[PDB]
């Protein structure tokens, strides 16, 4: 099924973006005074925070490339949620229409 | 209906995750200096905050297991919203297609 293929891919791409995201954030932010997004464990928590949009504001990037990273993480999280939701809708719709004989 | 079965389950699982979530947060965070997520009433508010993604940042976990708890809460909230939305789409689509005779 295309929808599960798409939902599966995005969820693997998301994990990859969260990991590379953590790595790249630290690389982009070290060098910038006042930057807090500068060790891998907290940076990875930051990435999860960001992908989900949970907005604690305990950590955020202060640099251009940190912020670019942030956006790729947001979009990957947002994209994968839309593809999961759309896959869940496709599943339910095709199952409801077989539950009607249609 | 599968979609309402799924939407109903997730909403019961969400309430359960919010309650266990509050309990586990406090257990994970007590022990960690500076932790604020350390009494049940505010921890339960924290859980709602987190599941919804409303991002006030008045409370957040500072520990590994607090943060793991946070993620299960986020995902439970995110998952249950996607299943409700997908159920609402299935309902409307099957009702629109009966409103066309189809």
């Amino acid at each position: 099924a295309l929808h599960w293929r798409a939902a599966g891919a995005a969820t693997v791409l998301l994990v990859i973006v969260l990991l590379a995201g953590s790595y790249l954030a630290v690389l982009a932010e070290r060098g910038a005074p006042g930057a807090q997004l500068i060790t891998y464990p907290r940076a990875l928590w930051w990435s999860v925070e960001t992908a989900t949009t949970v907005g604690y504001g305990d950590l955020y990037p202060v640099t251009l490339w940190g912020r670019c990273v942030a956006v790729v993480v947001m979009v990957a999280g947002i994209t994968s949620f839309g593809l999961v939701t759309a896959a869940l809708a496709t599943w339910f719709v095709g199952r409801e229409q077989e539950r009607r004989g249609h | 209906a599968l979609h309402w079965r799924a939407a109903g389950a997730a909403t019961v699982l969400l309430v359960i995750v919010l309650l266990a979530g509050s309990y586990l947060a406090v257990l994970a965070e007590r022990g960690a200096p500076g932790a604020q997520l350390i009494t049940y009433p505010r921890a339960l508010w924290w859980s709602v905050e987190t599941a919804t993604t409303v991002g006030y940042g008045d409370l957040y976990p500072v520990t590994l297991w607090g943060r793991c708890v946070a993620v299960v809460v986020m995902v439970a909230g995110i998952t249950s919203f996607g299943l409700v939305t997908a159920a609402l789409a299935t309902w409307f689509v099957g009702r629109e297609q009966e409103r066309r005779g189809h």
Partner: antibody
Amino acid sequence: QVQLQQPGAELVKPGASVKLSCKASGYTFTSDWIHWVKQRPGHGLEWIGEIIPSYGRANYNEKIQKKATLTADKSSSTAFMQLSSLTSEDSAVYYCARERGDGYFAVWGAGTTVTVSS
Amino acid sequence: DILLTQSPAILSVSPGERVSFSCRASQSIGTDIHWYQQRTNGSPRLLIKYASESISGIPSRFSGSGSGTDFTLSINSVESEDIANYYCQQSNRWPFTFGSGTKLEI
């Protein structure tokens, strides 16, 4: 075994330039940073800069006069600090240290004593 | 850029007493503070990471506490091998910074 290897000493003439080395061993990850720290005799520790060798990116203490340039060889896993145009203010023990990208210096080299004199 | 103040600069204690080194940060840094011992002519050695987390192969009499801006290294039952300079270091914000050190005299 000894995790970070540095020369014991380096003598340098006023105005001249020296390239210090820090050979690493033990567990290595692409996420490791090598830091350089300066100690003048009788004084404290002073952070100079850091490098991520598996990416070549280096950052410097912008609060002091920039005497250092950091480089790395990924095949021999050596970190280099090029110190240039040295005066006697630059005489000190220079340590290298390893950080696993988690904020603390788990292992240090024994230090290179740099003396600047004619 | 985070300033770490260590008081006092020299701590004189009696053998067997419990000793405490102070490290105050210029702004709130959670528990992102680490401690080092540097004996005479030796290189620094990590004693405590993240305010209170023990390190393998460090005597059980070294401990740490604190959070925010106030941090303490304690030694239970001080002894001769403890004679050394002690530094704190923060990793909360770029750049990492060290305190100025406290010397332990017995």
